[PDB]
């Protein structure tokens, strides 16, 4: 199994620096070019840089948008890819992906980015890291039966992202997690879950919330009331 895992994203002030990393396994690292691609929220993918394989002497290339400011590098001993980012600007806010690029020396050579990481998010801003408040959404009244909808409100955090799961991911069907909305330098998001009436409140339903930038971990049980 080819595995690529980005790390290092977070909140950085304008003008500041940040180095992203990408851990790889499951293939011969030095055989492959590696690329970084980013995607600002709601916008197109943008290729930024690559570093060639061993046969090519690990040389580098960059898009004009980042040349002179970013440096791509690799550690071949542990199979890591890096992106050093300097002189950051708001327009650099985005999810950053690492992707396995070509091996031109292989007889099976095809020219594509065939494997991609889950991506790591970067926010370039002067605003303050703020952890979320997490509130339960329980019904005040309901008809005599059937399905019941609950939720969690994840209010007042910065920067993106948060993760929300329900019963540690074991409730996945019937979940809606709404995209966060920014108002006054703080984000708010909500998540709803819909389960059969016969299972709640008789069985527990809990939302699990994480806010990486503040290392927040919250479990909130939804109690009738």
């Amino acid at each position: 199994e080819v595995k690529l895992v980005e790390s290092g994203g977070g909140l950085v002030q304008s003008g500041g620096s940040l180095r992203l990393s990408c851990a790889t396994s499951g293939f011969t690292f030095t055989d492959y070019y590696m690329s970084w691609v980013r995607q600002p929220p709601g916008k197109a993918l943008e290729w930024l840089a690559f570093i060639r394989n061993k046969a090519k002497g690990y040389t580098t290339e960059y898009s004009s948008s980042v040349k002179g400011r970013f440096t791509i590098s690799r550690d071949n001993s542990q199979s890591f890819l890096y992106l050093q980012m300097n002189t950051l600007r708001a327009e650099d806010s985005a999810t950053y992906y690492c992707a396995r690029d070509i091996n031109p020396g292989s007889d099976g050579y095809y020219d594509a980015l065939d494997y991609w990481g889950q991506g790591t998010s970067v926010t370039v801003s002067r605003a303050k890291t703020t952890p979320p408040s997490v509130y339960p959404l329980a019904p005040g009244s309901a008809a005599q039966n059937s399905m019941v909808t609950l939720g969690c409100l994840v209010k007042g955090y910065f920067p993106e992202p948060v993760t929300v799961t329900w019963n540690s991911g074991s409730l996945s069907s019937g979940v809606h997690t709404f995209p966060a909305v920014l108002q006054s330098d703080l984000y708010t998001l909500s998540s709803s879950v819909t389960v059969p009436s016969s299972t709640w409140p008789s069985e527990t339903v809990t939302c699990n919330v994480a806010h990486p930038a503040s290392s927040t971990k919250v479990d909130k049980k939804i109690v009738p009331r």
């Binding site: 594509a112 409100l153 995209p179």
Partner: protein
Amino acid sequence: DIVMTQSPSSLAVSAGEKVTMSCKSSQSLLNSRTRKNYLAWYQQKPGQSPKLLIYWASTRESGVPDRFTGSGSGTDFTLTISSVQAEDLAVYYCKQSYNLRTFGGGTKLELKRADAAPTVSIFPPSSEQLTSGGASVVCFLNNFYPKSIAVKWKIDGSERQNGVLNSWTDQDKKDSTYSMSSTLTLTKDEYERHNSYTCEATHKTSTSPIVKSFNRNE
């Protein structure tokens, strides 16, 4: 500069129907040495990383359903989906790799389905929030179609406009419906001045607003 452009920016197609989308390069991507077009297509579903569908313009990546076909050469390329499935909802990007790499701006594919009325739920502020002096009222509008919808908040019968924040999910990959959340935020002091809180949903599936409410007193 190799400039990549795609068309349409967005469209909607019913399940089972054919979809065609286009990609142009500002220069030919045909390597006369290799005889290959350095053009690839990527699929990005809501909240997922990009996935490789097609490379060399027409070679399907292993694992990709054969309803996906890439074609074209030179500066003009096409991705065709026969019998679109609900799971195919995504943004599709083409990308040249003739000279470094450059992505097009993407085509957003949505799915057309039968109209569906929203299921609407209203939630009062939690005791934990009120303890801290704030009061958020939340209304979920789930599983509706088309996307176009209006929510009105009424407090004690009158409309309240400021303090409202709205958010729509992407289309669902299974049932091709949409959902929306509306949150009205007040101070606890303002919340306690009034009794009736009402979320009113206006959707084409009915001529009367769907109305859900609760009373603070009760």
